[PDB]
Amino acid sequence: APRSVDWREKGYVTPVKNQGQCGSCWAFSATGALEGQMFRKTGRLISLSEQNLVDCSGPQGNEGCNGGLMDYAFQYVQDNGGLDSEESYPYEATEESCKYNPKYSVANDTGFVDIPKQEKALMKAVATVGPISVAIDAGHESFLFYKEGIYFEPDCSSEDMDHGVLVVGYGFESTSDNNKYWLVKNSWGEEWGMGGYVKMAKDRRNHCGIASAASYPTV
Numbered sequence: 001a002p003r004s005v006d007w008r009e010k011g012y013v014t015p016v017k018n019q020g021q022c023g024s025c026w027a028f029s030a031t032g033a034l035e036g037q038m039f040r041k042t043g044r045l046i047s048l049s050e051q052n053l054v055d056c057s058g059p060q061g062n063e064g065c066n067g068g069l070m071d072y073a074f075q076y077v078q079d080n081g082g083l084d085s086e087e088s089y090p091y092e093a094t095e096e097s098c099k100y101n102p103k104y105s106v107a108n109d110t111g112f113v114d115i116p117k118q119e120k121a122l123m124k125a126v127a128t129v130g131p132i133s134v135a136i137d138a139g140h141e142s143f144l145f146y147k148e149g150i151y152f153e154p155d156c157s158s159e160d161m162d163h164g165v166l167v168v169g170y171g172f173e174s175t176s177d178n179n180k181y182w183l184v185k186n187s188w189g190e191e192w193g194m195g196g197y198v199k200m201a202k203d204r205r206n207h208c209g210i211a212s213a214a215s216y217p218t219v
């Protein structure tokens with residue numbers, strides 16, 4: 001696997017979005033992964049509708065603003081036969097009736113792949129696939145108020161995750177020791193973190209569970 005990867009550089013990644021006061025991080029994580037796989041497939045980067053996922057993917061197990069899972073979102077897209085663009089179906093930050101319209105579908109998927117629960121497997125997936133949906137333990141004030149640098153939380157769990165995000169790459173800080181990170185796109189707007197991103201500690205014992213529930217859609 002290369003020593004660093006940043007799929008933003010290759011065109012795979014839309015600007016940072018903001019989920020607002022809705023428990024829809026899973027929908028943002030899933031749209032980010034499918035944005036990347038649709039870009040690999042077609043060469044077009046098209047922002048996808050989280051609202052479509054929030055409003056419509058109850059049968060697959062999602063719960064709107066009460067949470068959900070990226071794999072359930074990928075199963076919805078396969079069952080539904082499509083997913084609308086963000087432009088056609090903009091984000092409202094509350095769970096509403098389903099308004100999917102196939103005319104405005106711009107993405108599809110054929111299922112999903114669950115990555116083995118190990119950081120080396122995650123690294124190989126990031127290097128060979130594109131952006132990867134992951135779950136993390138974000139439930140510390142240190143993450144809420146993260147500003148810059150490598151995030152390392154000694155109380156983080158590797159087994160109990162509570163937030164869905166997107167790994168867009170990995171690398172290292174030049175600067176001392178234990179300097180590797182996962183480049184993670186959050187859905188808390190651009191003013192959180194580093195332009196909306198967090199450098200997450202890498203190869204530190206599966207810090208915050210980043211490799212424990214990683215997946216991506218097949219297209």
Ligand SMILES: *C(=N)c1nc(N2CCOCC2)nc(N(Cc2cn3ccccc3n2)C2CCCC2)n1
Nearest residue numbers: 023024025026063066067068069135161162163164
């Ligand atoms: C993301 N914004 C988010 N929010 C929540 N909430 C907890 C419940 O109330 C609102 C915020 N939870 C997550 N989770 C945990 C979760 C919740 N649900 C509901 C239905 C099925 C699975 C499920 N997981 C994360 C979502 C992806 C990884 C855990 N996220």
